[PDB]
Amino acid sequence: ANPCCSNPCQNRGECMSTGFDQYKCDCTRTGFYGENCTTPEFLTRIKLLLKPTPNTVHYILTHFKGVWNIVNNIPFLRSLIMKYVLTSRSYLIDSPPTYNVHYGYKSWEAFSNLSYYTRALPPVADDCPTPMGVKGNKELPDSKEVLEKVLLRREFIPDPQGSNMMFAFFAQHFTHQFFKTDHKRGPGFTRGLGHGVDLNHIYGETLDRQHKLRLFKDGKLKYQVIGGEVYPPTVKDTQVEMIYPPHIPENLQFAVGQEVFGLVPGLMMYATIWLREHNRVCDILKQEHPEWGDEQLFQTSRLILIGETIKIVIEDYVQHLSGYHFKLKFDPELLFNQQFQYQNRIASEFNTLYHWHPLLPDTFNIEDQEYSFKQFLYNNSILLEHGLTQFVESFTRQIAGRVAGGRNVPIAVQAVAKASIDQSREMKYQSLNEYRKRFSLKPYTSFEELTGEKEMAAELKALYSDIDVMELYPALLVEKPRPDAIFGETMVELGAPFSLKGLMGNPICSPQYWKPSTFGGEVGFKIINTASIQSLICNNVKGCPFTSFNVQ
C-alpha cells in the first residue's frame, strides 16, 4: 500500500509518500523535472542525443586493435582515456552511501551501521502487493524451476575470452575479502567492516587474529615448511579459528586471514602465494631500512601488498575480463584534479552479481589427475601433493566456463546458485529492468531481447510472464553475451562502477597517501607500480612458471 511501490520516479529521482495514497518525486540534480522526473532539461536533451550506448562503446574498445596499439603508447592519451573510465564509472555509485536491506529511505542508521551491505537500489517495501512492487504475480516463480530450466549446466560451455582457473580462483580469493556475509544476522549483513581492499583475507579482520598470524620478527607472518616449501601455519600452532570438517588432520588445517579459505585448494594456493609475498616484501624493506622494527616492517609491507593487489586487479585481472585493446592503468594521480570520494561501502548487488559459479569446470585438472568437486573441496593434501608450481602450470592451462549465455552453472553447486536467487528475494531486490535503468541502461522489452535466443526466453516468459518482473541474478547468467565475450551488457555496466570505485576509493590512492614515503621509499613504491600476476607468481612460486589469466 506504500504509494511508492510502483517505483514511479525515473532517472534517479527519489520517491516519498505524501499521504496514504499519494507520492512525490524529488528530481533534485537528476537533469529532469515533472511528476516522475521524466521531462528533460535542455542540456539533458543534448547529452542524451550525443551519448553513445554501452554496446557502441564496447564495440569501439574491442575493435581497431592497431589504432589502440598507437593510443596505448601515447601516455597523455592513455591517461586521458583512463581518467574518463574512472570518473564516468564512479559517478554511478552513491558516496557517501544511502540505502540498505532495512532502509528504503536515507537514515543515520543506514549511513552509520557498517555491518550492513549498502544498496544501489532501495528494497521493495514490505507492504507492496507483489515482490517487485506492483507488477507480476503475488509470488515469483519457483526458484528451483528457474534454476533447472535456464541455469544448470548440460554440457560445459567454455569461456570464449579464454579465462582460466588462475582467473577463476583469483576472482574468488580477491572478492572474498569484501564479500563476507554475516549469516548469523542475514544476507544483507557483512563481516567485512573495511568494505574494500584491506587484505583482511591475508591479515585477519580483527587485531587479535592478525596478531595470532604474525611472527613479531622482521614484520613477517608465521609460516611452516613442508618438504622444503613455505605454507601457512596451522590452527593448532596459531589458535586462529578456521572452518574445516572434522576429518581434516591437525597438520592440514592451514590458518590464514580468511576463515573459509580452507574450502578449496585454489584459495589456499593464492593464500600461500600472498603470504610468501608479504614475507618477501619484509625482506626488501629490512634491506632498505635496517633501523626499522617489526611493527613498521609489517605495516609498510601491508600497504605495499594493498597497492600490488589494486595494480594487479586493474592491469591484469580487469584488463583480461574487459576484453579491451585499450591498456588500462593503475594511476591514482589521474583523479587528483577530479571530484572523487576516497571511501566505499560494499553493495549487496555487487555481491550478488559476482556469484560467477559458471566459471567452475566439471573437474579440477591438476597434472594428470581430474578431481571431482567432492575430491577437491576441503582437501589441502592435493596442494601439498602437487605443489604450487604444478598448481599454477595446471590452472593456467585449464579453461573456465562462460558466465553469461545461460545453462552453465555446475550441478555440484546448484544449491549455491538457488541460494543466490532466494536470498535476492529475501532482501527484496527490485527487478532486472529497474537495475538496468539505475545504471543508465534501456529496459529489455522481451525475454528474447534479454537472451538473444528463443528457447530459454520462452521458458522464462512462461515462468515470469512480464519481462519487467524478471530478476537480476538469473538474468545476468542467461543474458546474451557480447560477441565471443564472457559477459552481457548488464554484468559489465553494473560490475564496472562497483569495481573501479572500490579500487580507487582506497585511502592509499588519496593524495596524502600516494607518495613514496608511505611505502618505505622509492623501492617500496616501485614494487607497487611494477606489480603483475606474473611477477607475483615468479617471485613466490618455485621455478617461476609462466602465468596469465588467459589460456594459451
Ligand X SMILES: COc1ccc2cc([C@H](C)C(=O)O)ccc2c1
Ligand Y SMILES: *[C@@H]1O[C@H](CO)[C@@H](O)[C@H](O)[C@H]1NC(C)=O
Ligand Z SMILES: *[C@@H]1O[C@H](CO)[C@@H](O[C@@H]2O[C@H](CO)[C@@H](O)[C@H](O)[C@H]2NC(C)=O)[C@H](O)[C@H]1NC(C)=O
Active site residue 354: yes
Residues at the annotated binding site for heme b? 357
CA 140, chain centre distance (Å): 27
- Residue of the chain from 45, 47, 51, 144 that contacts ligand BOG (CB under 6 A): 51
**Considering the rule CB under 6 A, would residue 208 count as an interface residue with ligand Z?**
yes
Q: Whose grid coordinates read 536467487?
A: 421
Q: How far apart are CA 150 and CA 91, in angstroms?
A: 34
**Considering the rule CB under 6 A, would residue 59 count as an interface residue with ligand BOG?**
yes
- Residue of the chain from 255, 382, 476, 527 that contacts ligand Y (CB under 6 A): 382
Whichever of 34 and 52 has its CB closer to ligand Y, that residue is 34
Catalytic residue among 354, 435, 444, 464: 354
For residues 15 and 25, is the Cβ–Cβ distance under 8 A?
A: yes
* Residue 393 binding target from its own copies, ligand BOG, ligand X, none, CB below 5 to 8 Å by type: none
Q: How far apart are CA 56 and CA 54, in angstroms?
A: 5
CA 184, chain centre distance (Å): 23
Catalytic residue among 58, 173, 176, 278: 176
Site for ligand Z in 113-152 (CB under 6 A): 113, 115
Cell reading at 26 = 524529488
What's at 40, amino acid-wise?
P
Question: Residues 496-515: x/- map of binding to Cl ion (CB under 5 A)?
Answer: ---x----------------
Helical (H) or strand (E) element with 299: helix 294-312
**Considering the rule CB under 6 A, would residue 207 count as an interface residue with ligand Z?**
yes
DSSP letter for each residue of 425-468: HHTTPPPHHHHHHHTTPPPPSSHHHHHSSSHHHHHHHHHHSSGG
Q: How far apart are CA 181 and CA 373, in angstroms?
A: 23
* Interface with its own copies: number of residues (CB under 8 A): 57
Phi and psi, residue 446, nearest 5°: -160, 165
CA 14, chain centre distance (Å): 27
Active site residue 116: no
Please identify, among the stretches 27-35, 88-96, 204-212, 382-390, the one whose residues bind ligand Z according to the rule CB under 6 A: 204-212
Which residue, among 486, 410, 473, 364, has the nearest Cα to 156 in the 3D structure?
410
- Residue of the chain from 2, 164, 322, 380 that contacts ligand X (CB under 6 A): 322
Whichever of 23 and 167 has its CB closer to ligand HEM, that residue is 167
Q: How far apart are CA 160 and CA 270, in angstroms?
A: 25
* Residue 239 binding target from its own copies, Cl ion, ligand X, none, CB below 5 to 8 Å by type: none
Interface residues with ligand BOG (CB under 6 A) are 51-57, 59-61, 81, 84-85, 88-89, 148-149, 152-154, 411, 440, 455, 459, 483
Interface residues with ligand X (CB under 6 A) are 85, 89, 318, 321-322, 328, 491-492, 495-496, 499-500
Interface residues with ligand Z (CB under 6 A) are 113, 115, 185-186, 206-208
Interface residues with Cl ion (CB under 5 A) are 499
